């Protein structure tokens, strides 16, 4: 069985727990690690080359009080760094998370995710999201509450870890139904805005 420890980090309140819990089996088969106060969600995705399991480490809120302990990071093979596109300070703190992460983990593939893009009054827009470009990371807009772009970070990570740029997910995992609607037009605009931003500067 192919599996990877994936650490999910970012400021308190950015939507990490809401994001990981979208995956229904990941939630039903989650494991609590009492010593570190972590829940590990085993998220299986079915690819054209078979199942890949991401064991996603979600905190119990301790990130609100400072950096996470070494044991949280140890043996991570990949990571998602999340911020909230409605809270500029959460984006300002991304470089801190990246530092703390790479201090313990070095090499690993990392996706940067701007969460909550379902919220109309967006504060951190495409033109301001630069950190990934500075550090060779992949970026996605997401909305945990609507499942918007849910699979994207996992698929990018899988391709990187497996070393197969043509890897595909055969089907989406079973997800909790969207609690909010992600306006298709809005999504189209944000995707374009990221394209424009990517070709810019």
């Amino acid at each position: 069985q192919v599996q990877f420890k994936l650490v999910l980090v970012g400021d308190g309140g950015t939507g990490k727990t809401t994001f990981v819990k979208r995956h229904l089996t990941g939630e039903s088969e989650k494991k609590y690690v009492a010593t570190l106060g972590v829940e590990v969600h085993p998220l299986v995705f079915h690819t054209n080359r078979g199942p890949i399991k991401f064991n996603v480490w979600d905190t119990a809120g301790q990130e609100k009080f400072g950096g996470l302990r070494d044991g949280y990071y140890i043996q991570a093979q990949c990571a998602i760094i999340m911020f909230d596109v409605t809270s500029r300070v959460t984006y300002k703190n991304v470089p801190n998370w990246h530092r703390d992460l790479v201090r313990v983990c070095e090499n690993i593939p990392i996706v940067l995710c701007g969460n909550k893009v379902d919220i109309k009054d967006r504060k951190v827009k495409a033109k301001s999201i630069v950190f990934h470009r500075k550090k060779n990371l992949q970026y996605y807009d997401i909305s945990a509450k609507s499942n918007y772009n849910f699979e994207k970070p996992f698929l990018w990570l899988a391709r990187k870890l497996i070393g197969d740029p043509n890897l595909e997910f055969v089907a989406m995992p079973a997800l909790a139904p969207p609690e909010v609607v992600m306006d298709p037009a809005l999504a189209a605009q944000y995707e374009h805005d990221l394209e424009v931003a990517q070709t810019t500067a």
Binding site: K31, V33, L36
Partner: peptide
Amino acid sequence: GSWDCEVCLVQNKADSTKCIACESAK
């Protein structure tokens, strides 16, 4: 040989008596 932690799922060495991550016993 190596052993997967049944508490946190991290892969550990044969030498390891406890998990390098979560300190759980083999």
